[PDB]
Amino acid sequence: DLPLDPLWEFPRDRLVLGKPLGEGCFGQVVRAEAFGMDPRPDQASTVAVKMLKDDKDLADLVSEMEVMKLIGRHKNIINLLGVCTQEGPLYVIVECAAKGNLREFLRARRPPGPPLSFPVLVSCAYQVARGMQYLESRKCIHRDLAARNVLVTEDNVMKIADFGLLPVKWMAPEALFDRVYTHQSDVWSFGILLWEIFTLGGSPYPGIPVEELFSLLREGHRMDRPPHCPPELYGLMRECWHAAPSQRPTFKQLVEALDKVLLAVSE
Amino acid sequence: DLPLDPLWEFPRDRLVLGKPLGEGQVVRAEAFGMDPRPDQASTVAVKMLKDDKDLADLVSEMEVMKLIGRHKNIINLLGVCTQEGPLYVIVECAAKGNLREFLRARRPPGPLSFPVLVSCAYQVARGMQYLESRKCIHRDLAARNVLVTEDNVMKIADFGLLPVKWMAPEALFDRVYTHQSDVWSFGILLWEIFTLGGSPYPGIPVEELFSLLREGHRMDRPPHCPPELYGLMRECWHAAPSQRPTFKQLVEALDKVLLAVSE
Numbered sequence: 356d357l358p359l360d361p362l363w364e365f366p367r368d369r370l371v372l373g374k375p376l377g378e379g380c381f382g383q384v385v386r387a388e389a390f391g392m393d394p395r396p397d398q399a400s401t402v403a404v405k406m407l408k409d410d411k412d413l414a415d416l417v418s419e420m421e422v423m424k425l426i427g428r429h430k431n432i433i434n435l436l437g438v439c440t441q442e443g444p445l446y447v448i449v450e451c452a453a454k455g456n457l458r459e460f461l462r463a464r465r466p467p468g469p470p471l472s473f474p475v476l477v478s479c480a481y482q483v484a485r486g487m488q489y490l491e492s493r494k495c496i497h498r499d500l501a502a503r504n505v506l507v508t509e510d511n512v513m514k515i516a517d518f519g520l521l522p523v524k525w526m527a528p529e530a531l532f533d534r535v536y537t538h539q540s541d542v543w544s545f546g547i548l549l550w551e552i553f554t555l556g557g558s559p560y561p562g563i564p565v566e567e568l569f570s571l572l573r574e575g576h577r578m579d580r581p582p583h584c585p586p587e588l589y590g591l592m593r594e595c596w597h598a599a600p601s602q603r604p605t606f607k608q609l610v611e612a613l614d615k616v617l618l619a620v621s622e
Numbered sequence: 623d624l625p626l627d628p629l630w631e632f633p634r635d636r637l638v639l640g641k642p643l644g645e646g647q648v649v650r651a652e653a654f655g656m657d658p659r660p661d662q663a664s665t666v667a668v669k670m671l672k673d674d675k676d677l678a679d680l681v682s683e684m685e686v687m688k689l690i691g692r693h694k695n696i697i698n699l700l701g702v703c704t705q706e707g708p709l710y711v712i713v714e715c716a717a718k719g720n721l722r723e724f725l726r727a728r729r730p731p732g733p734l735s736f737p738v739l740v741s742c743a744y745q746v747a748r749g750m751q752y753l754e755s756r757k758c759i760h761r762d763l764a765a766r767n768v769l770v771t772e773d774n775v776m777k778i779a780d781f782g783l784l785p786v787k788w789m790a791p792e793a794l795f796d797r798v799y800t801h802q803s804d805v806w807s808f809g810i811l812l813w814e815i816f817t818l819g820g821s822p823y824p825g826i827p828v829e830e831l832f833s834l835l836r837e838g839h840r841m842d843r844p845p846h847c848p849p850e851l852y853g854l855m856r857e858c859w860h861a862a863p864s865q866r867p868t869f870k871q872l873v874e875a876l877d878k879v880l881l882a883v884s885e
């Protein structure tokens with residue numbers, strides 16, 4: 356069916372699929388283990404596999420596979436590991452995020468109230484910012500950055516997912532109204548994701564109905580500072596929520612700002 | 623006699639000298655209106671002369687500090703007094719002294735957690751990266767020349783201006799100092815940090831050091847020090863300067879260690 360890429364092709368006989376994890380619009384993601392991912396070739400590793408689930412969905416999955424090859428590897432994204440393209444159905448082997456998405460990770464570790472110490476939360480934000488800075492340098496615009504689309508590994512490593520491819524509460528105004536997506540639009544979404552982190556997985560714009568959101572954004576109103584959130588991190592959210600994209604900080608400035616915070620708490 | 627710089631001149635009537643800290647000389651002091659509330663007082667330090675060409679040196683250092691500019695992890699200039707009488711050079715206060723005595727005083731008898739130590743190393747590396755970008759070679763980087771503030775902020779001192787255990791070979795044998803020479807010194811400073819202020823090359827006479835380094839031998843991994851940080855020290859101690867990492871690569875590497883801990 357598909358061409359054989361010597362840089363990525365993986366032996367079908369060395370990949371055994373496990374239990375599915377969730378159904379995605381552009382396919383399906385299942386657990387699996389791979390024999391020989393590290394070329395010891397006898398040592399096994401836990402991976403995830405994107406595949407189809409019974410069209411043009413094949414073209415989209417192939418498109419995502421090729422984008423991942425092109426974008427390259429980074430610590431804070433879901434990296435491609437191997438592909439099976441010849442002996443039947445298309446498999447796209449990617450890294451495993453044992454702890455699921457960042458949102459359910461945060462909600463499940465909420466104290467009974469009113470593990471998730473402040474440095475861990477700053478670390479989460481800083482890692483996503485590093486990942487987004489790398490994706491930007493690879494000319495990648497995510498268009499759907501949110502805590503649900505950030506995954507967590509066994510070692511609390513944040514990994515951005517679905518970067519190689521309605522949720523209006525995360526969208527910048529130019530994306531809400533003009534349907535245009537820039538890196539600065541992602542920055543607005545990063546501000547929302549910041550708020551998600553320092554609410555331990557809260558729903559954005561709480562209480563306010565979805566219809567009032569657009570007018571209240573147009574009238575200069577933004578979300579309030581979450582409880583126990585330092586003003587410096589809320590200042591960062593507010594900068595991400597500036598109306599003009601050129602006034603929002605770049606992901607590079609976000610990396611630096613969040614690194615000063617991480618260093619301030621580690622001192 | 624000294625030129626009047628509107629960007630830096632500070633009124634004497636707002637600077638009261640306190641108790642000295644070490645011998646030109648450096649004394650504690652209090653400054654009123656260092657931040658333009660003008661009534662608020664701040665704890666500062668003042669470089670001055672003792673009792674010469676030492677005046678020319680102190681003036682030279684003052685002007686170099688002006689050129690290099692401000693950074694979080696260096697001892698920043700705050701103001702100068704040059705008109706009415708003796709030259710004063712007002713700099714930031716490092717309330718906890720130098721990094722070496724800071725580490726030795728907090729040794730357990732057998733606060734200095736691993737994140738704090740990595741934070742110290744990372745901060746010095748950021749400061750050295752800035753100094754390098756300002757065309758500044760320190761030539762005497764060591765824990766004794768890193769100072770600590772109330773808030774545990776590392777600040778490189780004496781950057782605008784015999785200790786062979788910190789010197790790179792090209793500085794030992796050719797009297798040549800580059801940024802990569804400082805990188806070698808940073809490796810020694812790393813070792814100092816993760817020994818909580820230990821003396822380099824312990825149990826070895828100074829005479830044997832030069833042949834030891836020529837024979838490819840280096841200090842051993844300090845106790846409890848992770849292999850990743852010792853790998854960084856050893857890279858800083860590569861004979862060829864181009865094989866040593868740059869201060870930028872050191873910032874990245876130490877940031878990944880700081881992040882791996884904080885997760």
Ligand SMILES: COCCNc1cc(NC(=O)c2cn(C(C)C)c3cc(CN4CCN(C)CC4)c(C=O)nc23)ncc1C#N
Nearest residue numbers: 376377378384401402403433449450451452453454455516
């Ligand atoms: C529909 O999927 C949406 C997000 N997509 C993606 C999802 C994901 N994985 C998860 O979310 C996972 C959620 N869990 C549990 C909390 C049920 C997982 C468990 C495993 C495998 N383990 C881990 C630890 N064990 C002790 C046993 C088995 C894996 C695979 O390594 N992945 C997940 N990995 C990569 C991508 C990608 N790309």
Ligand SMILES: COCCNc1cc(NC(=O)c2cn(C(C)C)c3cc(CN4CCN(C)CC4)c(C=O)nc23)ncc1C#N
Nearest residue numbers: 643648650665666667697713714715716717718719720779
């Ligand atoms: C030339 O560099 C070698 C040493 N020079 C430099 C020395 C230094 N200061 C110290 O080492 C200080 C060591 N201590 C004590 C441990 C005795 C200090 C105390 C103060 C003032 N305080 C602070 C807190 N208090 C409760 C009371 C008074 C200051 C002033 O800021 N500096 C030091 N600050 C900047 C430079 C500089 N430059």
